[PDB]
Design a protein around this ligand. Structure first.
Ligand SMILES: C#CCCCn1c(Sc2c(C)cc(C)cc2C)nc2c(N)ncnc21
Ligand SMILES: [Mg+2]
Length: 210
């Protein structure tokens, strides 16, 4: 059973701004998603210090970047804390309302889209390069979920019956037809080195079989 939800109006407005504004420096989406993975890895590491059983779902803390030219996807995988159903359906968008307002005010005042992570809403910069985003996620003591949106004001959430993850999050970017450069090894390597070089977890860039 797939449930469909409307974004809060302020979040729909942010997503439309990201999709519609002319802004050539699209590559900053990857730093934003890696930074989110790093924060989620920090969170499970910290919680594990007082409850070590939180790592029973996996001790390895790391990030994989996986391009797939057949599927036209770039996937950002982490073994961080993961997200609950309440996170996906209400709580993250609730928090994002204030950062959206501030971000949009700052843009009117002269800021640019690359500063989006200073407002806590960098995830939505995925829509600079993706026509659809699918988030697969598993938090301790909750089930595995798939969130999905092609923008347009709505998103879906379902329980995910696919390959079980131990714990963590996969952000699957279904790239726009004209954004396939972000599947190329040399392009991703360049962006990771430019914007993500001091992240405190291994980042493994997978390479394409074909
Ligand atoms: C880090 C951090 C905390 C914020 C939530 N979050 C995000 S960003 C996000 C937002 C703002 C809204 C929606 C509907 C979906 C997502 C993925 N990425 C991850 C991640 N890799 N692991 C755990 N939580 C994450
Ligand atoms: Mg929302």
């Amino acid at each position: 059973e797939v449930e469909t939800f409307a974004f809060q109006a302020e979040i729909a407005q942010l997503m439309s701004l990201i999709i519609n504004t002319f802004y050539s420096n699209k590559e900053i989406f990857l730093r934003e998603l890696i930074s989110n993975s790093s924060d989620a890895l920090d969170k499970i590491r910290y919680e594990s210090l007082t409850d070590p059983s939180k790592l029973d779902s996996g001790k390895e803390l790391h990030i994989n970047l996986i391009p797939n030219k057949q599927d036209r996807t770039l996937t950002i995988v982490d073994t961080g804390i993961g997200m609950t159903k309440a996170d996906l359906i209400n709580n993250l968008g609730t928090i994002a309302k204030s950062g959206t307002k501030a971000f949009m005010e700052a843009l009117q005042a002269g800021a640019d889209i690359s500063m989006i992570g200073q407002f806590g809403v960098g995830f939505y910069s995925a829509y600079l390069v993706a026509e659809k985003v699918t988030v697969i996620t598993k938090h301790n003591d909750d089930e595995q979920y798939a969130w999905e949106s092609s923008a347009g004001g709505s998103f879906t959430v379902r329980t995910d019956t696919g390959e079980p993850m131990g714990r963590g999050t996969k952000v699957i970017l279904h790239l726009k037809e004209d954004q396939t450069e972000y599947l190329e090894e040399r392009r991703i390597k360049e962006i990771v080195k430019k914007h993500s070089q001091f992240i405190g977890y291994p980042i493994t860039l997978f390479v394409e079989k074909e």
